[PDB]
Amino acid sequence: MTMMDMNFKYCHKIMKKHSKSFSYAFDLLPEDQRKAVWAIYAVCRKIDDSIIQFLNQIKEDIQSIEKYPYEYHHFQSDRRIMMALQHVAQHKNIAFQSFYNLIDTVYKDQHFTMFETDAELFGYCYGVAGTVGEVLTPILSDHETHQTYDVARRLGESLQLINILRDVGEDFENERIYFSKQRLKQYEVDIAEVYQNGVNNHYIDLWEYYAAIAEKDFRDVMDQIKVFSIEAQPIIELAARIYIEILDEVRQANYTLHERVFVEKRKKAKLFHEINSKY
């Protein structure tokens, strides 16, 4: 166990801590690719939770790395991750701009006001997850064209959207609603009310209307999975398929707003089999 290794293993710990689904999937990659993904997840995880002196530190470390990839830096933030990322950046191409978007997006959240329109919601989704998918693109593809970044973005955005959908109650508890004012009003939904009195027909419909957007985006990515390298395809199929499965979970929980639903490891394993079986 070198020193890099320990850094990467911390990264890995973080990812497995916070995303049982993506770990499950992405741990099935070649060693080189799965390490890179650990580093990037961790950096992003670190920014998402960073909340404000830490976040500028993380931005500064990343600017360092981008300017002078092959210098030693005294990282202000988390040194274990920045080394792991710096190591990646030496061998692979990192969309630094996408990190800066995510960072920007996370600033703006300290004064979160509700989105006026779906457009704003989809634009948050980009900043929060579309950005991640872009950062990962060079890792999961042999040759990176515009439609490679496009797909991975679309996947990223839809997964974030599936997040929102699972997390509706929890998010309300933390004084956040991600459904847009225009869509709430059109569908006649008061999220405060549903939280108290259970679900109804108007909620289900709004929730089902977003769900439709996700499933559709998921399908659109499956039919373009080829843009990713051959080892990564079934991995990315898996990750996505597990995450759509989250939607049927919420349905069986009757769209509850008083627990995180989950896809038990056995189901995860079932799906790896279905997907693996046709590769």
Ligand SMILES: CC(=C=CC=C=C(C)CC/C=C(\C)CCC=C(C)C)CC/C=C(\C)CCC=C(C)C
């Ligand atoms: C938790 C989970 C997921 C979490 C988050 C996700 C996302 C943020 C997707 C979008 C983000 C992407 C592409 C990059 C990540 C980095 C940032 C967005 C900064 C599913 C697995 C279940 C767990 C770990 C236990 C939870 C308990 C239950 C399900 C009962």
